[PDB]
Design a protein around this ligand. Structure first.
Ligand SMILES: *[C@@H]1O[C@H](CO)[C@@H](O)[C@H](O)[C@H]1NC(C)=O
Ligand SMILES: *[C@@H]1O[C@H](CO)[C@@H](O)[C@H](O)[C@H]1NC(C)=O
Ligand SMILES: [Mg+2]
Ligand SMILES: [Mg+2]
Ligand SMILES: [Zn+2]
Ligand SMILES: [Zn+2]
Ligand SMILES: [Zn+2]
Ligand SMILES: [Zn+2]
Lengths: 476, 476
C-alpha cells in the first residue's frame, strides 16, 4: 500500500529523474505550442483526477505534459484589466506584447472597437508565426474553435476588436468593412495567414456569404460583402503552382495525401467544433487527429515549423459552469500533446503547453481518495444540503430555489453534461480568473522556463531558442 | 506608458536574467523553509496585487520569493483524501512520506485517533529537522500559530491525531494520556524537539496546567496532568550546562543576548498569535522579527541549521472567508522571506517557500488595472447586485438574505476586517482546496525544483542538497 517505503521510493526516483536532467542547449527547429483556453491550474488538477477515474489510477494519474521537467508560472494581467480576455492574452503569448482588453495584434495605444487603430502599422505587434515565416519556415494552426477566434487569430491578425471575425461583425459595430479588414479576410489575403501551410478548426461561416450555403449543413453564411474566401484561398494556392486541399470532415481529412499536399484547410463546422461529449465521432476529427495531420504536413519542411494547437472549448464550458464538459475538452488536448510527443524529436522540437488565462474553478473537500471528481463532496453543516467537490467563483451555476434555499444538486444533475455546477457570484457567462497559470515545456531550451514570468515573455523565449525574430537569439 | 517598446524591453531583460542564471551545485549548509498555510496560487497572485496597492505598483509588483529563478508545482493529495489537511501535508513535506488525514509523522498504516499506532516505531516518519540533528547541525521553528499546531508539529511529533496538542486533547478522545504522548510533551521530552535551539510562536496554554495561570493573561492552562513543561524545558537546558531563555513579549525577545544564549523559547500568546491587523505591535513580535532572531541564534552553528517559518494564520483567515486578513498574513510572511534573504549567504543557504495545501480563493473579472484587489468587481447581470473581485468556492461567506436574495456586499462590508467574502458552497469553516500549490526556491540546488512533484518530494530533495538523511546525497 501507500506506506512509508512506498513514498520514499516514489521520492528517491523522482529525485533520480531530476538529477538526470540533461540541458538542451541547441537550436529549436520546430515549435509546437499548445494553448488550453481557460485552463487554470485547478482545471489541470481536476482533469488529472478525471483522467485517473478513467484509467483506474485516480489521484496518482499524471497528465502527459506533467512528465516534462520544466514548469513555470505566467502572470496574465493585461494593460487595462486585471483579468484578461482571450484576445489580449493571445497578443501577449504569441506576439510578445501585452495589450488592451479585446484587442489582437496591436499595442496598448489601441482603443477597442475603433478600427482606425488597426490601420496604423506602427501599433502592430508581430507573431511568432510571422517570425517563423520571415525565417523561411512553415507555420500552421489547429483549433477546436472557429479559426477566426481570438486565440488562433493571435498568430496572424491585427484588429481593434476580436469580435470582428467576419465583415458582418464589423458592420454590426458601425465600422467601415471596406477599409476595416475582418479576421477571416486577414487570414486569406494578408501575411502571415496567407502563407500558413495548415489551417484547421471551425468557423466556415465567416468565409462565405449570406447568399451561399454551408457545406454539410446548408446554413447561409455570415459574410455581407459577397466574398467566397475558401475559393479565394484555393485559387491563390493554385496560381502559385501548389497543391491545396479543402476538407470538412474526418474521413476526408484522414484521406489527405500528405506527400503531395502543400496547403491544407480543414474547416469542420459552420461554427466552433462540437464538444468532445457531443460530437459525432464519424464526422469530426478529434484534436489529436488534427494535430497529427498538421504535424505530418508541416514536418516536410526540413528547415522547421511552428504550429499552434488550441484546446479552445475548455473556456466555453467553464463560462457556462459546465465542468464535466470542460474536463473532457481538456483531456482531448492532453491526448494531442501525447500525439505530438510520439511524432517528433525532442532534440529538435520544443513542445510548450500553457493557458491564456484561468477560470474560477475550485476543488473543495473532503471526498475520499478515488472519488469521481465530478461527484458530491459531502453535506453542508449550515443548510444540511449536499455540495459538489467542484465549483466556481463566478457563473450561472448559482441558484436560489423558488422557496429561497440553496439549490441542492441531485445525482441526475451530476451526470447531465449540461448541468451547471454552483458558483459564488451569479453571472450569465462566468468571468475568467486572474490567477497565474501554468507553463510546461520540453525540448531545446526548455530550461528557459523555470520561474515566474510575464505572459508576454513566452514567445520572446521561444524565438531565442528557435533563432527567429529581432530579439536576442541562440544563433546570434 | 505600457506600449509595445515597453513590453518588449520588459521581456528581453527577463530573458537576459534567465540566460544569466548560474547553477549552484554546492552543498547547502543552511535550509530555511517557509510554509504559507493555505497559501494557494490565487492567494499569492492576490497578495501580489495587494502589496502593489500599498507600494503604488499595483499589478506590476513582485512578491519577494517571485524574484527566485526556480518555481515548481506540488501535488497535495494524501493517502485517504483528495483535499489534504495541514497534518498529513506537513508529514509529507517535512518527513517525505504522505499519510492519512489528521496524522502526523506516522505512515498510512495509521488509523486516525487510535493512539496505539503512535506507539509503533516501525510506522514513524522522520523529519528533516531530525536529519539535521543526526548530522550535528542546529534546528528551529517559528510560527504565527501555536507551536503545537500541525505544521510546526510536523518537524518533531508522532501522533495519531493532530488534535492532540496537549494532554487534555488526548483525554477528550478517550485515549490514555499516560502512554499517549501529546504534542507539547513530545516537543519538550523527545527528539528532535528537545534539541531545537529555537522555538517560537504561540500556544502557552498547552504547556502549563489548569491550576496554573498564564503569564500575561492569567488564563488557567489546559493541561490536566499537572506538568509545567516550560520549567521542565528550562531545567533540562540548565542541567546540560547551557544558557536558556524563555520570553513572551516583543521587548524581551529583542533584548535577547544572542551571543550568550544557547536555547530560546518564545511563546507570545496563550493560543495562536493575534492576526497582523489585530495584534498589539508593542507586545507581539512580527513574523519577520521572529525570523531575524531565529536566524541570529541558529547561524552561530558553524556547521549549519534548518529553520521552519510558518505564515500560519493565512489558513485561519481563509477558513472564515476573511480575505482581507489572509492577505495581510501572507505579506507578513513575504516580508520574512526578505528578512531571511537580507541576512544569509545564498551560496550556502537554501530558501524554499511553499504552501501545504491551498484554499478555494478565486480572482473574478473584470476590474480595471489598479483597482484595490479587495474592491467590488462590478454588478451581476443576473440579479443586478454587486459582487467582489475576490471570492471563494467554499465557506461561511455564502449568504441568502431574509427575503431570499443574494446578499449584496456593501462598501462598509469591504473595510470590515471580519467581513466574510462570498462563497459558492456554505460551510461553517471553508474547506481547503485540492489544487496543486507552488514551490519557489533559491540557493544551492534550487534547480532541483523545476517541474511538477508530489508534495513529499520536497524534503528528499532538500536532504540531497544539504547532505543529510539516508537517501541519495550530494556528498555521497
Ligand atoms: C476613433 O479614433 C479616431 C482616430 O484618431 C478618432 O478620430 C475618432 O473620433 C475615434 N472614435 C471614437 C468613437 O472615439
Ligand atoms: C486500536 O488499535 C489497537 C492496536 O492494534 C487495537 O487493538 C484496537 O482495537 C484499536 N481500536 C479501535 C477503536 O479500533
Ligand atoms: Mg481561445
Ligand atoms: Mg499551519
Ligand atoms: Zn481565453
Ligand atoms: Zn472566455
Ligand atoms: Zn494547512
Ligand atoms: Zn485549514
Amino acid at each position: 500500500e501507500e506506506d512509508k517505503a512506498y513514498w520514499n521510493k516514489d521520492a528517491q526516483d523522482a529525485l533520480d529523474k531530476q538529477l538526470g536532467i540533461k540541458l538542451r542547449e541547441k537550436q529549436a527547429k520546430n515549435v509546437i505550442f499548445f494553448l488550453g483556453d481557460g485552463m487554470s491550474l485547478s482545471t489541470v488538477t481536476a482533469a488529472r483526477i478525471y483522467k485517473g477515474g478513467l484509467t483506474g489510477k485516480f489521484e496518482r494519474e499524471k497528465i502527459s505534459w506533467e512528465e516534462f521537467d520544466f514548469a513555470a508560472l505566467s502572470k496574465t494581467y493585461n494593460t487595462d484589466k486585471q483579468v484578461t480576455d482571450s484576445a489580449a492574452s493571445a497578443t501577449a503569448y504569441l506576439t510578445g506584447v501585452k495589450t488592451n482588453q479585446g484587442v489582437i495584434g496591436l499595442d496598448a495605444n489601441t482603443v477597442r472597437t475603433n478600427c482606425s487603430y488597426q490601420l496604423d502599422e506602427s501599433l502592430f505587434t508581430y507573431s511568432i508565426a510571422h517570425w517563423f515565416q520571415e525565417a523561411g519556415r512553415s507555420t500552421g494552426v489547429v483549433t477546436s474553435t472557429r479559426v477566426t477566434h481570438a486565440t488562433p487569430a493571435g498568430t496572424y491578425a491585427h484588429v481593434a476588436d476580436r469580435d470582428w471575425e467576419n465583415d458582418s461583425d464589423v458592420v454590426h459595430d458601425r465600422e467601415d468593412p471596406e477599409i476595416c479588414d475582418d479576421i477571416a479576410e486577414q487570414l486569406v489575403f494578408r501575411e502571415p495567414g496567407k502563407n500558413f501551410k495548415v489551417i484547421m478548426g471551425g468557423g466556415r461561416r465567416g468565409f462565405f456569404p449570406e447568399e451561399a450555403l454551408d457545406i454539410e449543413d446548408g446554413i447561409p453564411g455570415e459574410r455581407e460583402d459577397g466574398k467566397h474566401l475558401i475559393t479565394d484561398w484555393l485559387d491563390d494556392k493554385a496560381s502559385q503552382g501548389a497543391t491545396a486541399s479543402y476538407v470538412w470532415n474526418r474521413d476526408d481529412l484522414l484521406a489527405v495525401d500528405i506527400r503531395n499536399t502543400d496547403y491544407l484547410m480543414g474547416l469542420f463546422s459552420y461554427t466552433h467544433l462540437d464538444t468532445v461529449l457531443t460530437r459525432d465521432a464519424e464526422m469530426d476529427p478529434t484534436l489529436p487527429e488534427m494535430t497529427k495531420v498538421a504535424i505530418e504536413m508541416l514536418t516536410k519542411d526540413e528547415n522547421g515549423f511552428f504550429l499552434l494547437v488550441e484546446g479552445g472549448r475548455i473556456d466555453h464550458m467553464h463560462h457556462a459552469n459546465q465542468i464535466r464538459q470542460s474536463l473532457a475538452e481538456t483531456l482531448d488536448m492532453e491526448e494531442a500533446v501525447s500525439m505530438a510527443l510520439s511524432m517528433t524529436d525532442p532534440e529538435e522540437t520544443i513542445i510548450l503547453v500553457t493557458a491564456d488565462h484561468g477560470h474560477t474553478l475550485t476543488i473543495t473537500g473532503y471526498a475520499d481518495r478515488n472519488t469521481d471528481i465530478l461527484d458530491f463532496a459531502g453535506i453542508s453543516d449550515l443548510d444540511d444540503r449536499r455540495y459538489t467537490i467542484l465549483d466556481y467563483g463566478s457563473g450561472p451555476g448559482y441558484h436560489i430555489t423558488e422557496d429561497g434555499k440553496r439549490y441542492e444538486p441531485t445525482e441526475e444533475d451530476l451526470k447531465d453534461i449540461n448541468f451547471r455546477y454552483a458558483s459564488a457570484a451569479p453571472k450569465h457567462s462566468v468571468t475568467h480568473d486572474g490567477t497565474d497559470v501554468g507553463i510546461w515545456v520540453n525540448g531545446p531550451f526548455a530550461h528557459l522556463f523555470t520561474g515566474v514570468y510575464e505572459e508576454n515573455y513566452i514567445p520572446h523565449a521561444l524565438a531565442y531558442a528557435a533563432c527567429v525574430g529581432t530579439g536576442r537569439t541562440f544563433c546570434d
